[PDB]
Amino acid sequence: SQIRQNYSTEVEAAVNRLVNLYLRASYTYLSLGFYFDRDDVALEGVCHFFRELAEEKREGAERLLKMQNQRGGRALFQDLQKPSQDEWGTTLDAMKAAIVLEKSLNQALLDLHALGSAQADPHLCDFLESHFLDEEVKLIKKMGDHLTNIQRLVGSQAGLGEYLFERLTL
Amino acid sequence: SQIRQNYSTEVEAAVNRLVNLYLRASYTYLSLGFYFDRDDVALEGVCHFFRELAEEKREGAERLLKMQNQRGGRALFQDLQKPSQDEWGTTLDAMKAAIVLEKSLNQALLDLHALGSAQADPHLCDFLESHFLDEEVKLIKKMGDHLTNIQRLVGSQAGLGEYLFERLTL
Amino acid sequence: SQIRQNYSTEVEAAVNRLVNLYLRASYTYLSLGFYFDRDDVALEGVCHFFRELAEEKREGAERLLKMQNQRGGRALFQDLQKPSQDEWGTTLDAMKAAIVLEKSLNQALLDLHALGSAQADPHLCDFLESHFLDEEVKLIKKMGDHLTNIQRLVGSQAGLGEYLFERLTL
Amino acid sequence: SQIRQNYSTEVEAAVNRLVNLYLRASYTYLSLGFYFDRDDVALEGVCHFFRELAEEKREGAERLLKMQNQRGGRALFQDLQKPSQDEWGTTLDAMKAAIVLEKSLNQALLDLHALGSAQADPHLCDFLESHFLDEEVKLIKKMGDHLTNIQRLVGSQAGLGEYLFERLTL
Amino acid sequence: SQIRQNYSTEVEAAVNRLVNLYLRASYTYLSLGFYFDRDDVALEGVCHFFRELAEEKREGAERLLKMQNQRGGRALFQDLQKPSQDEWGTTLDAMKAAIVLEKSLNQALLDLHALGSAQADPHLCDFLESHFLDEEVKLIKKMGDHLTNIQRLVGSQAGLGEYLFERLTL
Numbered sequence A, B, C, D, E: 001s002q003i004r005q006n007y008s009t010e011v012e013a014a015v016n017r018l019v020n021l022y023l024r025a026s027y028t029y030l031s032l033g034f035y036f037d038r039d040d041v042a043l044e045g046v047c048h049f050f051r052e053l054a055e056e057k058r059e060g061a062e063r064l065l066k067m068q069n070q071r072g073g074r075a076l077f078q079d080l081q082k083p084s085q086d087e088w089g090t091t092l093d094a095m096k097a098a099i100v101l102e103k104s105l106n107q108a109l110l111d112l113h114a115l116g117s118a119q120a121d122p123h124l125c126d127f128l129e130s131h132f133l134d135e136e137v138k139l140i141k142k143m144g145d146h147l148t149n150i151q152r153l154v155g156s157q158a159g160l161g162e163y164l165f166e167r168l169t170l
């Protein structure tokens, strides 16, 4: 490109891989949201928590694609793998799956930041620090808080606890 | 001082000791608040209850220092001891620790009032009656109410009760 | 912690030490503020300058503790040493002490940033760059400006100059 | 009186003496205010500081007379002695005279409070604590602050300092 | 040009030289403004006085370039010489340098007006009378007033005077 400066082919490829990862995560959260809308599951606040995450992760992919074109890189899309499960269990199982997925996104962000640092690409480092790394730490902390609250509610009356969480936290 | 009148060295020293006690209590409540913000504890209303108490106790120290200078006494600061615990247990354990601490502050206020009375210092007596003694009785009553509500919630489903208290009272 | 990722024990400990340093600085500024409120000192703008700094440094400690829990580290509080002086001299002496203290906080921030960089912790580096390093440079520049203005006012009429500074700058 | 209860003849007489003292102080401050309005003195902020104090002390006398009738005591007025000086010197001399006068009022208030306490008259004790003792401590602290600021301004250019104080503090 | 009428090559060249002179003066005032923002100089009102002059002189250059194109002349830019000093001394030294610079701009304006008059170019004469000559006389009078006020403040307490000027005039 006429505009490309200081933007390695390694970073360009890793940004494309990260876009795939974010779109995969959006699709996983779409599947989690619609599972909680099942008439035999029926946890509306859980459905809305995951549907909002699906939108967030799509928006993160769109911001990475915007940056890829601002740097003069070329977006390359790959197939999007289906989510790992078709049914997601309890709200506890689902929130455990969600923190595993967000940990994996965070590790991908950290790996890209490290690549950027090795390539002396400060605009990439800044972009990630500014729009991704703190949002991901904040999200992971929120999920961990949720996770602890769900766990303390299981006790010996798991249905009751699952209802309450949904009603009073989500 | 040019302005000092009717202000004994005994009262001056005891006001400095009370400032230390209030600042110690602010620090204890800061530690309690951040313990309830842990991802493995995650009781937001409990965190906010103690963080608000940390601010109150700091403000009480600042009011005592203001009065010390209005009387012509001299503020003398000492080291502030760390809180008694690093981890605070359950919300019940924490509220028991908080009432023990507020009882000890109240006894210090009563002891200063008695000193004032023995020194015939009515401005000191009035200052304490006006800004401290009723606030402390009101706080201790609120903690005792909380304490009773937490206790009735333990039953055989302690996690559930701890969640509910947090959600519906705090 | 379930949420901890990329957060070294070295950084965790250094954040706890920095919290102690910020709380120590808040306590120093509380002592400076109340010294200028003495009836025999009576520099209201000087008192308000330091009282505002006490609040800032407390808020900096609270932000570090928030981040410590967002990363899955554990807050550990230590005793808070009393300020270095009981009486702080002239406004010049006090502003010299304040710049020495802010230089020492800045060096602690830089040392933590360096640790973060050695540990490849970009979220820590970003957090410090975002909330601490520019605020500290801005503060140190303001104190240096004050310092120069106080110095030019001493001349042969130090009382007059101290009054004027207080009245017309603070 | 039909309404008198728990109100000793000693307290009644001492309240009448305190009314005389407050009215004397109002008259002293009237003389101080008009001295600073002299064309050969011409310190407008000093004049307004003392004129406001004249009004305060008159209002304090009126509140004591109101209380005397609410208790069923009988107001008895005596001659009001002229102020101690006809010309009041510098603003420093005048503020020294004003703090001497306020110290003497405070000692009279404390003496009445002690009498009340010896007579087991809590309504009198409360009335003084509520409307007089803290106002007098606040005033004496303000005068002491002023006093320190005037003193630091004398230096070797006393006229300049007196102008500045008036202009920038009062 | 198709539009050029009554616009001599001598005037065209002198307008280009005047643009250089105005841009040089803008750069001088930028250097003066940032010198007064030094932490070891720290005269904020002095910094703002010169920074505003830097903007004025840039705007004067832009108005001359606008007029050059409205007449069908051709802008020709030359190198811009650095300011005459790197450090500017006291506010007195700086205001003396500023009046020397404004006198030199005024003499350049008068010389161009004279050229215009010799070339019978009334649109040029009007343009200068309308947008430059009275603004320059007003500015030079303001600087001279400042200069007199700074001079009366030096006395035997130059620091004090420099502070006061900055605080109370600028």
Ligand code: NA
Binding pocket: A052, A055
């Ligand atoms: Na939405």
Ligand code: NA
Binding pocket: A130, A131
């Ligand atoms: Na951005």
Ligand code: NA
Binding pocket: B052, B055
């Ligand atoms: Na609050």
Ligand code: NA
Binding pocket: B130, B131, D134
């Ligand atoms: Na009060």
Ligand code: NA
Binding pocket: C052, C055
């Ligand atoms: Na504030």
Ligand code: NA
Binding pocket: A134, C130, C131
């Ligand atoms: Na932030």
Ligand code: NA
Binding pocket: D052, D055
């Ligand atoms: Na009035």
Ligand code: NA
Binding pocket: D130, D131
């Ligand atoms: Na009343």
Ligand code: NA
Binding pocket: E052, E055
């Ligand atoms: Na401007």
Ligand code: NA
Binding pocket: E130, E131
């Ligand atoms: Na025009």
